[PDB]
Write a protein that binds this ligand. Structure first.
Ligand SMILES: *[C@@H]1O[C@H](CO)[C@@H](O[C@@H]2O[C@H](CO)[C@@H](O)[C@H](O)[C@H]2NC(C)=O)[C@H](O)[C@H]1NC(C)=O
Ligand SMILES: *[C@@H]1O[C@H](CO)[C@@H](O[C@@H]2O[C@H](CO)[C@@H](O)[C@H](O)[C@H]2NC(C)=O)[C@H](O)[C@H]1NC(C)=O
Ligand code: BOG
Ligand code: BOG
Ligand code: LUR
Ligand code: LUR
Ligand code: NAG
Ligand code: NAG
Ligand code: NAG
Ligand code: NAG
Lengths: 552, 552
């Protein structure tokens, strides 16, 4: 078998075979040399001594709030820190991208083919003795066993950071513009050829789909009026394809950019909000540009809403789950004097640690009503019944589950959680420890250290036997939560590089785009730089209800 | 009507309408302020004073050969200048790309849609009074008039720099991997979705086409043996589509990556050479990696040949036409400490100024034979007759015409030259002077200054009346050539940024790719770093005839 199967190369060295039973490690620019790139250079020895731990950084950013209250009001220093936050995370990601599910080596097929999710780590070779190379048994433990024992939800474990359902459905709505798996090809394939925040979940993946959804007047998208409230148009009125149970009434078959956003009314809520936001920016742009035609009013409104998205995600969405007292900042001009690639390819592993199944409640509580999963699914009549106002007010109050910590996956979606385990195996994922070393983390030495707890850790040791054979996805949902937080170390340290790269690696953040003229002047430019989840609801949702990603 | 038709904004400022008859210029990071971005900042005033002219740079690099002979042997200094050569040219190009033929403003359609050629300058609005904006008459002069008078070839004007037919057909073969116009859509559209050097003109634009051309054993491409000589396979044996006169025998219908390379036997020569080179590198990679399968031997051989191409282009191809005594250097490690986007998008204007029609001779001289255009076109039996050896030996001897200077377009291809004039008009190109200011050149003040001569300059003034209405493409072929050179100032200053960006903006030049493991070891890695047009022929062409881009 592959002499590279054992995963010998350390510190991001690359293993190439030099015979049937021989390998060589390429230690090019890894700060290490030696057979498996383990002998550190003198400057590397220094850096290794001087960088503190992720757990060290998290403590500082989650404490000393009073001194952060000072830092948050010193522009240069605030800009200085955010500059290091952006830069230091963005060396973890290969750009241009390297591997995918079919190529454990760099190739033009891997690079050029955009139908692929890329890969932070190359897939385990198909001729390897074990599913993880050389370690463990011939076959990995039963997914159903792992699922039931340490993953499935017994009693509801609420998020200590106080995440609500506004946060839950945002994450679902937001990330599904680039998490569009091509099931007809496999789990390692995406239909999101934009590979980032293009808002195709609002406008459409293709130009053909977009023109069906557009009104072709004043740059607006088509809509319908029900009960005096603005909602998306219908599938019959537009003939864009949507995924629905064939028993759904025609007037309830809404048509939006993403074809699956009819799944849950939570997605259709944001889909309605973000649609209203488009036709609001259009009105503002026509207010300043009466000379503009429909085509330019649309394209400009799109770029603005893209910036609005990134703005909200950083200073509202990421701000919340980080639990940082340091107040984040969406500002592309911090990267202009830095080496940064304005491009991004979505990774399979980033879609993997995004399966925040524990974030889903047991019932969906709206106004004075508790809906089961069976009642909520594909039921937009719920949305028409309460309206967006009562929807936001309710979802801002209902709390979401804890992702990390173990045993919090709602049993309604058990099959989906078991699929995440199965698909990651099918895509020949490397072990948890290999992904930790990949992101400069220290390999867990025991299952107990992973959980900071004895019960589940004993369950896991009976299943996997060896800590170096533990799988990535189940480890995330059981990892010892950070203190009073929603995630563990591995979730944040792996997901943060993937996230800030897809956001800042957007063409509108590049110096040639990041300028008032691109967005229709200072008026349109302001819309982006002052964007927030509160004003997004205040502007589009009737009555302007208070909203947040946190419960009061 | 559009207030920005007059092209008011200077120094790369962007024009935006602020009313039906009102405009605003965005002077963001242009080094200028004021109404049309013309008031220079103090540091800009300094740089403007200290920045030498392009003609100043050209004289230095084309003189002091003895002192350059010293510079060429001092690695650091040699690395130092090339670093400035790469960097200083690569700020002229927008990256990520901005405009295309349909969008004179930044938009997501312009950025995401890869079917478009991008645009250095946005197209003139469709509602502008004149085809150039506001200057000139209602209609531009007759293309046939311009063509016949100053463009068409009277007596053959040989290239002073001594370009041969090896250089002419290389340029045609090389640049046609990203110059694949989608005529079904229009001149502003490309079928080259790779938008760079992907060698799809050898392997294929699509994965489907590639698999038809591969042998699927040892990573090699399919071929046939005629007269003991290796040639491309046939259309019947592979069923890849090729463009042929349906009167062509079946054994003469060769199948290569690019579907039009059956046009002239000069293209079919390199297509045969570059095919032989593939199955030569495969044998070497199998020599080092007997454990490798067909798929990896192919993908690795492609990446190497990609590097081989870039290597040859810089240090042989660009080296020649530059006429520099300074010896160029293909070395990606010069950009690692520099801000550089490893991405590229092809521009309509770059395809325009690469219509080197004057480079084409009156007859095609092989061995002791002189072929007309009518005899050469679609006649591969010429290639079988003389073989590659006699093909290279002859083409290295035959000289090519002078591009700039005026009146050197062979009349046999006059319609192609008239198409270049027409297409540029159809694509709403801005004037010559607007493209010069765009690339920091000084606007020509008279037609004579442009020609450095009186007669063509008068014929041109009778046609266009005003120098600010002169078109880009005809200006290139009549421009006052540099001292005993093939081009004028505008050709080099516009084309050099476009070229070095598409070359270095290749993923294999990125730090994560540029390492021995990517190319199968140090044996494969050296193949790239030692690549040259001489060894490319020596290795693949029988007898190893001396070859160059210059006549002896
Ligand atoms: C990207 O890769 C996928 C998978 O290798 C390609 O999809 C295959 O395309 C061939 C071409 O005809 C088909 O025969 C296969 O059935 C396809 N397989 C799957 C799983 O889709 C895809 O064509 C590639 N994309 C590009 C642009 O080359
Ligand atoms: C890129 O833009 C071109 C031109 O706008 C698109 O081509 C058009 O596509 C629509 C979609 O159905 C067709 O109805 C038109 O006939 C096409 N016109 C031309 C001239 O080709 C193309 O689809 C766009 N590409 C992408 C990926 O969106
Ligand atoms: C300037 C103040 C520096 C304090 C740094 C905090 C160091 C303690 O940080 C600790 O790191 C541990 C490592 O696993 C974690 O388990 C703990 O949760 C965390 O408190
Ligand atoms: C060592 C410094 C020598 C200065 C070299 C530049 C001066 C001569 O350069 C001249 O510049 C003109 C445009 O600028 C061109 O028309 C001439 O052909 C070119 O020779
Ligand atoms: C899987 C994951 C991991 C981390 C984050 N956000 C985040 C974080 F939680 C801490 C520090 C930085 C960032 Cl960008 C996020 C949020 C997101 O970018 O969608 C997801
Ligand atoms: C239209 C054009 C302009 C310039 C060049 N090469 C070139 C040159 F001619 C002088 C200095 C640098 C470079 Cl990269 C070339 C040759 C090429 O890179 O294909 C074409
Ligand atoms: C790592 O290097 C050591 C010696 O430095 C060698 O014995 C070993 O085989 C290498 N690989 C692994 C996976 O340990
Ligand atoms: C949809 O929601 C409504 C409440 O508005 C509920 O009465 C109905 O039963 C739901 N549909 C299904 C199929 O459960
Ligand atoms: C440039 O600015 C001047 C004043 O600074 C103004 O009169 C003129 O209209 C502007 N545009 C052009 C094309 O000159
Ligand atoms: C093709 O070239 C051959 C010379 O090898 C010549 O005899 C023949 O006439 C040419 N074909 C045509 C159609 O002119």
């Amino acid at each position: 078998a592959n002499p590279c199967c054992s995963n010998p190369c350390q510190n991001r060295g690359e293993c190439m075979s030099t015979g049937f039973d021989q390998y060589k490690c390429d230690c090019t620019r890894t700060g290490f040399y030696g057979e498996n790139c383990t002998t550190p250079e003198f400057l590397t020895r220094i850096k290794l001594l001087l960088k503190p731990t992720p757990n060290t950084w998290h403590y500082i950013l989650t404490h000393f709030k009073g001194v952060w209250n000072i830092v948050n009001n010193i522009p240069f220093l605030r800009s200085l820190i955010m500059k290091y936050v952006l830069t230091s995370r963005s060396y973890l990601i290969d750009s241009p991208p390297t591997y995918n599910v079919h190529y454990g080596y760099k190739s033009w097929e891997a690079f050029s083919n955009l139908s692929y999710y890329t890969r932070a780590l190359p897939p385990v070779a198909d001729d390897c003795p074990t599913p993880m190379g050389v370690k463990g048994n011939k076959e990995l433990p039963d997914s159903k066993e792992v699922l039931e024992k340490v993953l499935l939800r017994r009693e509801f474990i609420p998020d200590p950071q106080g995440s609500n359902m506004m946060f839950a459905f945002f994450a679902q709505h937001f990330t599904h513009q680039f998490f569009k798996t091509d099931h007809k090809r496999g789990p390692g394939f995406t239909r999101g050829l934009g590979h980032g925040v293009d808002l195709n979940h609002i406008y459409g993946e293709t130009l053909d789909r977009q023109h069906k959804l557009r009104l072709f007047k004043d740059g607006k998208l088509k809509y319908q009026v029900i009960g005096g409230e603005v909602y998306p148009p219908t599938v019959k009125d537009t003939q864009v394809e949507m995924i629905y149970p064939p028993h759904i009434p025609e007037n309830l078959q809404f048509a939006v950019g993403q074809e699956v956003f009819g799944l849950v009314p939570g997605l259709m809520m944001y889909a309605t909000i973000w649609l209203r936001e488009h036709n609001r920016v259009c009105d503002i742009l026509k207010q300043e540009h009466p000379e503009w035609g429909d085509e330019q009013l649309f394209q400009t409104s799109r770029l603005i809403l893209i910036g609005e998205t990134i703005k909200i995600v950083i200073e509202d969405y990421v701000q919340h789950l980080s639990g940082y007292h340091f107040k984040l900042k969406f500002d592309p001009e911090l990267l202009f004097n830095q080496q940064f690639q304005y491009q991004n390819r979505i990774a399979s592993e980033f879609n993997t640690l995004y399966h925040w199944h524990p974030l889903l409640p047991d019932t969906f509580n709206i106004e004075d009503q508790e809906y089961s999963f069976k009642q909520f699914l594909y039921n937009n009549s719920i949305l028409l019944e309460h309206g967006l106002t009562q929807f936001v007010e309710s979802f801002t109050r209902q709390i979401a589950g804890r992702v990390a910590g173990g045993r919090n996956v709602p049993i309604a979606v058990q099959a989906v959680a078991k699929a995440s385990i199965d698909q990651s195996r099918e895509m020949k994922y490397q072990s948890l420890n290999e992904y930790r070393k990949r992101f400069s983390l220290k390999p867990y030495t025991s299952f107990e250290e992973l959980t900071g707890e004895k019960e589940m850790a004993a369950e896991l040791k009976a299943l996997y036997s060896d800590i170096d054979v533990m799988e990535l996805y189940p480890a995330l949902l059981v990892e010892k939560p950070r203190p009073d937080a929603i995630f563990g170390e591995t979730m944040v340290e792996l997901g943060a590089p993937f996230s800030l790269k897809g956001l800042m690696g957007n063409p509108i953040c590049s110096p040639q785009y990041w300028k008032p003229s691109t967005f229709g002047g200072e008026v349109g430019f302001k819309i982006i730089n002052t964007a927030s989840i509160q004003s997004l609801i205040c502007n589009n949702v009737k009555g302007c209800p208070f909203t947040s990603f946190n419960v009061q």
